[PDB]
């Protein structure tokens, strides 16, 4: 029996991750209790306290930064592993995806297609995830020599991405490049509401693998993070108690200009 | 602290159900442990056993029919609630949705638009949920005087639905009418692989309220189950220790022929 804590379950990515963490754990003879923090430090605080109180062998977890302290203490006693998100400072084994290879290829591809300017739709800047990927998109643009692009600093709600993406399209974006599952939804909602055919009137780059992204009238080019391998690796590290690269799935949502 | 046990989490409907259950219970002062049974009775049996051994107060559960007996004993001591699915036998308070009003109106609406024949893609026949909805769709067709329509008896994998939906189209279906989220995915895949424009070349009725359904080029008429209300009902019956109408959201995936 192990414990897993995740910020959201309506996020298909985090529900994929726990399905795969659970399946790998059972193959190594271990059960799985899941918790959901709603991106709320107090809630996760509540969970960790509870999980270790009840004799779980290990914890695989997506750290809120506002929990850095309690998370260190449990190490000082509890086998802990962090996944997807990184603690901003000081030892706890972490397995995360490296976003640079996918982001660089998506930018490269936008550049060859003259599908510019790009409206990149950021995620919460309070996550290692949100900043890692915005650094990488910025460097890729320089490295691809297309110059500075449009950036919206999003957050958590589908509403935030819808509002973000609609503003990028106002500012002239010809490509919407989401940096999250949830931002990717806001981009779709935005193209739908504005009357635009993706892969025809505007280009989209999505983030993560949702089954329904592959089945749009023009399937979505997306950045895959390979959830299965991260979950495999993360449970390997929990039993014995690192980065998985990221990839571009080329589909049909980029116009050639 | 309470335990909620759900058969899947990649299922958007059950991820929404557990998010709303957690939310509602913290508004009544209760943390939340979630478990995921992958439609396997060994795992749930294991899980059930776990959450009682560790002194969580209540259990909200989506029951696997081969756990009726074990669930029974928990009552004889644990405040237990079955959601979504029902036990076929004798007791335990259950809050489920009633699928008849939604199913009747989707059928009624297919009948007015002569959008026939209908291929109804059932879910598993060993869930109270799969039978109920197949009975109700059969009666709605008699009640609307359209005759017997085509049925496929589906299951669990997006794959099964995609196979069933493609088979129904070979057999002449002009409307595909899923009985699940997963079946609704398989239905979309089937129209895409086949090259059919939903809303234009074929009609679709979907099941449950994925945000991405409302966005498709022709958004999807779907049967909404009101997960939020089910979840609130189930949590009141837990704190102080029944059916919820189903509804048709009329969008634009039915042709007028």
From TrEMBL, chains A, B:
Top-level division of the source organism's lineage: Bacteria
Keyword flag Oxidoreductase: no
Molecular-function GO terms, alphabetical: DNA-binding transcription factor activity; transcription cis-regulatory region binding
Keywords for the protein's UniProt record, in alphabetical order: DNA-binding, Transcription, Transcription regulation
Annotated protein name in UniProt: Transcriptional regulators
Organism from which the protein derives: Corynebacterium glutamicum (strain ATCC 13032 / DSM 20300 / JCM 1318 / BCRC 11384 / CCUG 27702 / LMG 3730 / NBRC 12168 / NCIMB 10025 / NRRL B-2784 / 534)
Organism phylogeny: Bacteria, Bacillati, Actinomycetota, Actinomycetes, Mycobacteriales
Residue span relative to the full protein: 67 to 335 of 346
């Amino acid at each position: 029996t192990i414990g897993v804590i995740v910020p959201s379950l309506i996020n298909h990515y985090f529900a994929a991750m726990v399905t795969e963490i659970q399946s790998t754990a059972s193959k190594a003879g271990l059960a799985t209790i899941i918790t959901n923090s709603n991106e709320d430090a107090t809630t996760m605080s509540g969970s960790l306290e509870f999980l270790t109180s009840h004799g779980v062998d290990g914890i695989i977890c997506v750290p809120n930064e506002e929990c850095a302290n309690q998370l260190e203490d449990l190490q000082k006693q509890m086998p802990v592993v962090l996944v997807d998100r990184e603690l901003p400072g000081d030892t706890i084994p972490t397995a995360t995806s490296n976003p640079q290879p996918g982001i660089a290829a998506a930018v490269e591809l936008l550049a060859h297609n003259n599908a510019l300017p790009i409206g990149y739709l950021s995620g919460p800047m309070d996550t290692s995830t949100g900043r890692e990927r915005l650094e990488d998109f910025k460097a890729a643009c320089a490295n691809s020599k297309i110059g500075e692009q449009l950036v919206f600093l999003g957050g958590y709600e589908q509403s935030v991405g819808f509002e973000g993406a609609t503003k990028l399209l106002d500012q002239g974006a010809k490509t919407l490049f989401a940096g999250d599952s949830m931002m990717t939804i806001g981009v779709i909602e935005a193209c739908h509401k504005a009357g635009l055919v993706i892969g025809k009137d505007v280009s989209v780059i999505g983030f993560d693998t949702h089954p329904l992204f592959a089945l749009q009238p023009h399937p979505l080019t997306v950045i895959d993070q390979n959830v299965e391998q991260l979950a495999q690796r993360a449970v390997s590290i929990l039993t014995e108690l690192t980065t998985i690269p990221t990839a571009l799935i080329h589909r049909e949502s980029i116009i050639n200009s």
